[PDB]
Amino acid sequence: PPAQLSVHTVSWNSGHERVPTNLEELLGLNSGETPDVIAVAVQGFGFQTDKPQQGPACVKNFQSLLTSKGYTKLKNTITETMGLTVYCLEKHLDQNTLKNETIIVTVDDQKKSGGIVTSFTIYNKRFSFTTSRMSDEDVTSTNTKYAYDTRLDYSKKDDPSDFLFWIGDLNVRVETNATHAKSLVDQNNIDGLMAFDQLKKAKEQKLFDGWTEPQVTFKPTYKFKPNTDEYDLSATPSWTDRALYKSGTGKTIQPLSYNSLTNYKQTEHRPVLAKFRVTL
Ligand code: HEM
Numbered sequence: 001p002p003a004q005l006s007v008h009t010v011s012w013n014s015g016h017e018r019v020p021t022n023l024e025e026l027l028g029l030n031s032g033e034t035p036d037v038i039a040v041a042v043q044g045f046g047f048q049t050d051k052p053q054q055g056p057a058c059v060k061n062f063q064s065l066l067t068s069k070g071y072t073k074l075k076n077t078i079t080e081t082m083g084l085t086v087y088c089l090e091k092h093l094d095q096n097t098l099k100n101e102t103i104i105v106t107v108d109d110q111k112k113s114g115g116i117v118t119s120f121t122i123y124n125k126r127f128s129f130t131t132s133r134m135s136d137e138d139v140t141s142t143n144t145k146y147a148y149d150t151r152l153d154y155s156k157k158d159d160p161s162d163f164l165f166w167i168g169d170l171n172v173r174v175e176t177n178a179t180h181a182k183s184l185v186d187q188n189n190i191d192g193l194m195a196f197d198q199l200k201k202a203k204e205q206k207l208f209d210g211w212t213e214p215q216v217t218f219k220p221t222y223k224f225k226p227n228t229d230e231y232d233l234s235a236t237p238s239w240t241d242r243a244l245y246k247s248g249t250g251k252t253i254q255p256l257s258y259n260s261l262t263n264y265k266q267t268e269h270r271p272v273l274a275k276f277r278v279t280l
Pocket residue numbers: 014015016017018019020040042044045046047048049050051052053054055056058059060062063073076078083085
């Protein structure tokens with residue numbers, strides 16, 4: 001039992017975009033780090049109805065890279081609008097204790113909104129990875145637009161997990177006008193703009209209770225004109241893709257790094273990469 005383990009997470013509201021050439025950058029492996037656990041969350045349209053038939057390239061390309069580095073894919077789950085994959089180094093796995101489990105929650109009769117939770121145990125400590133997706137317009141169990149449901153929160157369990165991560169587009173936005181938002185961004189006043197971000201409002205309403213976001217130092221990750229760094233001001237610049245963390249059991253989770261990946265420009269949203277060190 002190591003005293004500590006590292007986790008990398010990435011999410012991207014990637015829409016219809018395809019596997020990039022440079023997956024090492026996407027996963028935070030380009031400076032030679034070797035995280036114990038990797039989670040990849042996507043939001044978009046048509047993943048199960050793989051009409052472009054891009055599923056096979058995703059599997060080939062991710063598998064080729066990660067197996068060579070000593071990872072086992074614990075689970076990939078795809079719905080029409082979400083994807084969640086969790087990888088763990090083979091060396092940490094004990095089949096008799098792993099207890100690998102995934103649930104899918106859907107909130108609407110078309111199965112477009114909800115979330116996915118994948119959980120597993122290593123060294124007798126339980127990890128859970130959540131992603132979620134909600135539309136602006138739906139009726140919800142919270143009567144808010146935010147992509148929260150108690151069923152996706154394993155910290156609310158009678159026996160809550162040791163290490164929990166929630167990654168994706170939480171449907172949290174910057175509640176001010178585009179002019180004022182752009183001005184803040186031009187001044188690099190990230191904390192000033194974050195003052196208008198809705199995560200705190202969701203928490204006042206008792207959603208994402210006790211979940212922590214690492215400090216944000218990067219500019220809003222949406223909405224860009226593709227293949228530029230120029231905001232499309234038809235939307236107020238916002239932080240779409242987020243990483244939250246919690247422990248149910250008093251374990252220390254230390255963010256090492258939290259950043260958008262500005263080199264992935266192909267789309268309106270920029271992926272977000274988080275790195276953590278967890279103490280068992
Ligand atoms: C950059 C965008 C995307 C990322 C980062 C991504 C990520 C992933 C990952 C990590 C896997 C599992 C790979 C493995 O087996 O180790 C996967 C599988 C898959 N993805 Fe994606 N995905 C993307 C876009 C898409 C798109 C656009 C489609 C369809 C339109 C799609 C459909 C699939 C399918 C069908 C699978 C296979 C699931 C199975 O084997 O049953 N994904 N994706």
